Design a protein around this nucleic acid. Structure first.
Ligand SMILES: [Mg+2]
Ligand SMILES: [Mg+2]
Lengths: 471, 214, 471, 217
DNA sequence: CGTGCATAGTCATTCATG
DNA sequence: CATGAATGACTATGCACG
């Protein structure tokens, strides 16, 4: 047996498969939680294993093996390296993993092997997961059909813009600048109220990228273009001070302090520019780079051109919406994030309401029993099996099924507490909760308002000043 | 380095190209050493359609172990060169890459009917008495699941055993192969140059217009 | 501040530390479970994670990460490679791990990376762990003080001799030949009855090594020396057949079929010997190596000398007893194994007896309640708290503490079953079990007899014909 | 390749020898770049007491970055060469190995008082308000545990790359609060005798040395 | 060239012993 | 130079894009 296929056609299928997987499943972030899958699987798996900010740290390698084993059929290194990025304050704005030990730096030194380091999920990280456990989001099977995985996260905050993301796949690549969590949410909220929102006004809220490495960003015009179209070019200049000497205390995002320094000194030895006179003295708590004819402005101004003390940063904002590559601006990203939070909210409530209704129906039941208690126990005693017990209650006092298991499985000290007042209290509580919920579920404005609250409550907790400045 | 067959006969001996050492192990193990030779590659293969080339160990070795040469000339050395990659999607990329190498350089080899693709299982599902199936991609899975379970997924060839690899995807009695032939040249060149090419501008449009992201 | 130390003294401390750890904790097997620590930690960790022969397989890398994270502060590779040996039928006699995928072979091909393979604990492996969960063996803390680890295994069978072990540390190295589980146990049992046993008689039972690769072993004299002193040299010859051609269907333990073959053909090309005419045709299910002037006996006889078709195997039987390196013979190894099983047995029983006594005291209690039931419930109702409930029972019917929790926490359908006959049945059962146990615990012959039974019950299940032959 | 200090001054600059890149990272990070230079080795070091030698990258580099040479001659290049290894037992072996290299070849260096051993924590134990201790070997641990009583968390550095920058400095590099070991030799005869047994090539005696001297309690 | 996820590999060293 | 646990690292590839 042999099937005869062409070259053209075989080349087609085979490429088409890979092109797809690469785009969705590997490189490109979901527009909703702004996460690539490795990231997602790391968060989910870690949190599932409860490895949270409040509890102790956990040997990264264990973490990696568990992900690989349960969720992610790939190299250890691919996973762990990604895990390490998420622990990189100069790379991510709001970090989603805390690691203890050597995880590289701005000098580019390489992160310590996984058998060394230890990691946990950060605080804000939890907010990405929040309400996961309440059927708020679509699950799939893992590769083995052994256990189910989330396809996206709830996403309490708009991770995508916040922490940016890059960015290389077949046909598409992406770069998205980090942003100021506070500012981002401001925009989100505004759009929630005035959906038909123009960029110019959105800009009043989200004015442009916030880099974790501070720096100076210049190019309002092109920035707008980026936010409108999804593509743009911006200028980023290290932050310069003059001492009486050039003091550098911030450099451009994604740039390598170490090599950056050598490139500067190479300028001196090559004596390519005039007054060139270059030392790096930075330590655990601050960045400092030190640089006759004080043609200083010429030296500095030249440096910007001829080196990476000032670079440009490029916008290619490409995410996955509707299972597909899209290049989008602030408006699509924001809108879609919002709409997500809606489904999440409604799903949350729907699940909560049912949870409520069950214990309510069960409580309603216990209440009735409290009044027939003497006779009820009498019945149970005269009953043959546990099941015979249940079935006799259903026949006589026509309790329901679930009410039966509940009354029967009741331990005994629970009889110590016959007191319909308390049950009534809980019942009042439930009824209040349910009718409140049913509102969100069918009150569309009531729903969006809750979206607004939660977002504000987040903006408050994780809010942080700007670090990058705009010129 | 290669694990060659016993008999040296270019009339009925096959060359099995594999994604690496780990996979290669299972290859060598479940195999009729009479006329089956096995050659590992170190992962993803240089895009030959994008001097850089001949200097790449992995390509250079393929050439030597096959005879012929890049020009080409033929009958060395086996009447089948079979590409056997992991059953996952990265496998398809390597298939893609290897093929454009053959098509680009070793063209007659391809034009002839001496380039084969081997189609090893991805999923195996099971329910003294056992019932077992094999699936080759996600689609296949659903029907298998409905039919049946424990599901096993081969994250690479090194993950199945000797008995399996043979019985499913090497033994000619019960195996099934793909034979790669070209029915234009124009269409071929056109396609390979877009997908594997160097321009991107069009590759993208090809995806956009052709990749069903459902 | 600086402490001034010599070279001599510093060199002393530092070496002395390493020398110790290396000997005990790394290389050398415990004489009781005949396991090096990595091995032990792999078994324990796997089994703890219930990864057993009866249930599905589990992604080795997950396995490795968990060990590394919980028990074993070292390289992934060190651990996984060891895990892979334990999955090697031609290396170990009775295998303690089953792996699915490529785990090397006799041709020496390298095992598939861990991200590929999947593994579980074998069947007999469990017997090494059996009764672990019943406080049968000394536990210690892990490196992190986060969780406790066994210092040795229960060891239902005499793993050390069975699977042999090697073997490299500071000052000491070890090689111990695998042995025939059946035969080994035979010896063990005999010694149990006649402790003052001479080797010559023990030899009647354990006659010498059983290699997993079959082969022919010649040297009874030196073997005895090995079993007596702990050191010896033996001859091992591949098993030869003549076809009308030399057919090889077994080679010597620890020998590399692949290179072995090249070395043979190198003989031909070097034409070092006469009739040299060499092909390897072995497939999944059988070993076969094929080799005018049919000076055949000269060719074969030469091959033995000039190549590894016949080698010698060396005995260096060195294990850890009493926390220290000892070179020992069969008698020490057997004796010590036996004495171990004693502690294990007694500890098992001691723990079982207590478990018994508690439920017995609790059962005895429920029985009493069944007779006061009406009034008891009445009390519970008139009681204020769960605790007030308990305390009132203790005051009135002077039940004990534990009896109280038991009666109180009783669910309700449990009242459906008031029937002192059943409880009495269980009580009879417990009393029988306890008094039986107390015997083993203070009856020394009764104890050794149970040792004999369990050993036989094992010899039966895992028994296997000899594979190596003695000349 | 090495991560050298800013000032090039053989009067007060130190060379930190480390067990590898991962550890080296934390080294470079928590450190006063004014006078602290850092050189990684690839794991276990050639037993110099057992041409094979000089051909071993790891030894050859050490020689070059230090000046002097193997013969020797002195003042290059730092008034301290400090051996900083993982705090576990494999660390002690590397300490052992490095020292016999210095003692064998760079002897005066050793005889002088320019070879140092750095003593970084192995265990850190913890109970807004925090109480923290450091232990250096199993013995130390028991008293620490007893002190901290309940609620403690114990951390064990399976290698230097596992502690942070602040820690490595504050504990084991900053001269104000650090403590170093200075290796001097008070015989030569005793030294040779000892090194040749332990690190030697004969084994027959090494064993007896363990037997008679290693307390396997 | 580097960037971030992926494909898949390799090398030095120790220690005892034939 | 293997052998078995350890110490500690490295290399080639695709993919878009400035
Ligand atoms: Mg693969
Ligand atoms: Mg270390």
């Amino acid at each position: 047996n042999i099937q005869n296929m062409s070259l053209e056609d075989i080349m087609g299928e085979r490429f088409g498969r890979y092109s797809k997987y690469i785009i969705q499943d590997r490189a490109l972030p979901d527009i909703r939680d702004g996460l690539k899958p490795v990231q997602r699987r790391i968060l989910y798996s870690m949190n599932k294993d409860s490895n949270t900010f409040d509890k102790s740290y956990r040997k990264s390698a264990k973490s990696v093996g568990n992900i690989m084993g349960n969720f992610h059929p790939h190299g250890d290194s691919s996973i762990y390296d990604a895990m390490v990025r998420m622990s990189q304050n100069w790379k991510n704005r709001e970090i989603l993993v805390e690691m203890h030990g050597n995880n590289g730096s701005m000098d580019g030194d390489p992160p310590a092997a996984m058998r060394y380091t230890e990691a946990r999920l950060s605080e804000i990280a939890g907010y990405l997961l929040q309400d996961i456990e309440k059927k708020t989001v679509p699950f799939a099977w893992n590769f083995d059909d052994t256990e189910k995985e989330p396809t996206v996260l709830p996403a309490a905050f708009p991770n995508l813009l916040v922490n940016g993301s890059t960015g290389i796949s077949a046909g598409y690549a992406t770069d998205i600048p980090p942003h100021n969590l506070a500012e981002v949410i401001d925009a989100a909220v505004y759009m929630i109220d005035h959906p038909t929102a123009k960029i110019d006004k959105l800009m009043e809220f989200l004015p442009g990228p916030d880099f974790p490495t501070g720096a100076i960003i210049q190019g309002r015009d092109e920035i707008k273009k980026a936010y409108e179209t999804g593509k743009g070019r911006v200028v980023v200049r290290s932050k310069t001070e003059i001492e009486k000497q050039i003091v550098i205390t911030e450099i451009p995002y994604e740039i390598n302090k170490a090599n950056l320094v050598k490139k500067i000194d190479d300028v001196r030895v090559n004596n390519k520019v005039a007054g060139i006179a270059v030392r790096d003295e930075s330590d655990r708590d601050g960045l400092r780079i030190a640089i006759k004819d004080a043609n200083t402005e010429l030296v500095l101004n030249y440096l910007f051109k001829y080196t990476d003390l000032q670079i440009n940063y490029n916008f290619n904002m490409v995410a996955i919406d509707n299972f597909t590559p899209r290049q989008v601006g602030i408006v699509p990203i924001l809108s879609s994030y919002i709409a997500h939070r809606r489904e999440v909210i409604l799903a949350r409530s729907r699940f909560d309401k049912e949870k409520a209704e069950k214990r309510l129906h069960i409580v309603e039941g216990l209440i009735r029993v409290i009044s027939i208690l003497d006779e009820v126990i009498a019945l149970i005693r005269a009953s043959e099996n546990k099941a015979d017990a249940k079935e006799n209650l259903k026949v006589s006092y026509d309790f329901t099924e679930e009410q039966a298991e509940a009354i029967v499985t009741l331990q005994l000290y629970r009889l110590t507490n016959t007191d319909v007042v308390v049950l009534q209290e809980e019942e009042a509580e439930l009824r209040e909760k349910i009718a409140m919920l049913a509102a969100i579920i069918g009150d569309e404005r009531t729903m969006y308002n809750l979206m607004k609250k939660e977002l504000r409550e987040v903006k408050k907790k994780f809010a942080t000043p700007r670090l990058s400045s705009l010129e | 380095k290669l694990t060659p067959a016993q008999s040296k006969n270019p009339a009925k001996n096959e060359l099995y190209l594999v994604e690496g050492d780990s996979a290669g192990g299972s290859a060598k193990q479940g195999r009729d050493r009479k006329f089956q030779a096995i050659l590992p590659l170190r992962g993803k293969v240089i895009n030959t359609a994008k001097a850089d080339i001949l200097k790449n160990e992995e390509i250079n070795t393929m050439i030597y172990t096959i005879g012929a040469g890049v020009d080409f000339s033929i009958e060395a050395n086996y009447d089948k060169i079979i590409i056997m990659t992991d059953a996952d999607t990265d496998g398809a990329h390597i298939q893609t890459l290897l093929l454009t190498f053959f098509y680009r350089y070793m063209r007659p080899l391809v034009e002839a009917g001496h380039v084969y693709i081997a189609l090893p299982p991805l999923y195996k599902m099971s329910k003294k008495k056992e019932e077992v199936a094999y699936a080759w991609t996600d689609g296949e899975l659903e029907e298998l699941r409905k039919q049946f379970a424990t599901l096993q997924r081969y994250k690479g060839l090194g993950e199945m055993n000797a008995d399996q690899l043979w019985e499913t995807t090497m033994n000619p009695e019960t195996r099934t192969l793909i034979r790669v032939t070209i029915e234009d040249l124009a269409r071929a060149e056109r396609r390979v140059n877009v997908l594997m090419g160097d321009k991107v501008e069009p590759r993208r449009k090809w995806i956009e217009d052709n990749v069903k992201f459902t």
